[PDB]
């Protein structure tokens with residue numbers, strides 16, 4: 001992508017790690033607590049450059065990675081965390097060209113990883129039953145690209161009421177309070193062999209969705225797990241895990257769709 005251009009998102013990091021994000025606009029002045037930075041001074045610079053404020057405070061300038069962008073969007077429905085989005089893409093096998101169904105669009109954080117994984121030849125169909133939440137996702141997804149992707153369909157309705165054709169999606173991902181309520185729709189929509197990933201914060205949700213999947217009888221035995229992420233301090237002889245860590249985000253569940261009338 002080269003040097004910074006107009007319209008681009010830029011991440012600024014001051015001398016003690018606070019991150020600031022802006023959209024480059026000629027003539028605009030970016031304001032922080034360590035001074036102000038002119039957008040005109042950043043437009044044209046190479047990534048990884050250090051700019052100086054109006055008060056001399058030094059700032060590192062970089063293009064945000066998708067994970068940086070997703071974690072700094074406006075307040076709204078809780079975004080999925082990076083370790084979980086990574087495994088949804090990977091264990092959910094979101095392949096190039098896939099047709100993916102998603103429900104809860106929420107803030108669109110997972111949506112952006114799903115769109116990146118399927119690429120221009122694939123498609124993402126996201127349901128968001130709340131109109132207000134949907135506007136957040138729509139705004140966040142467009143803000144990553146500069147415009148609405150043409151391979152993204154956002155449907156403002158309950159997924160349970162979906163009218164899409166049978167077997168029209170290759171992969172499905174659910175992040176909502178009550179995923180068992182949309183399982184009949186998912187079972188109809190997802191093709192044979194298709195992968196379903198479910199993200200649930202509590203063990204009561206976890207048990208209920210795994211048992212609902214088994215009761216529907218058209219799914220492989222569900223696989224359920226959690227991941228814990230722990231940062232490390234690696235400074236001279238002081239090499240040790242960090243003292244604070246996030247204890248939990250949510251559990252993951254993976255299952256695959258059986259063929260019409262198959263058992264095992």
Ligand SMILES: C[S@@+](CC[C@H](N)C(=O)[O-])C[C@H]1O[C@@H](n2cnc3c(N)ncnc32)[C@H](O)[C@@H]1O
Nearest residue numbers: 079080104106107108109110128129158159176
């Ligand atoms: C936890 S948020 C999803 C966050 C999303 N994974 C992201 O990273 O931003 C759950 C979303 O699912 C939505 N929702 C819940 N049940 C739904 C249903 N049956 N159909 C469609 N949307 C639903 C909620 O309105 C909420 O916006």
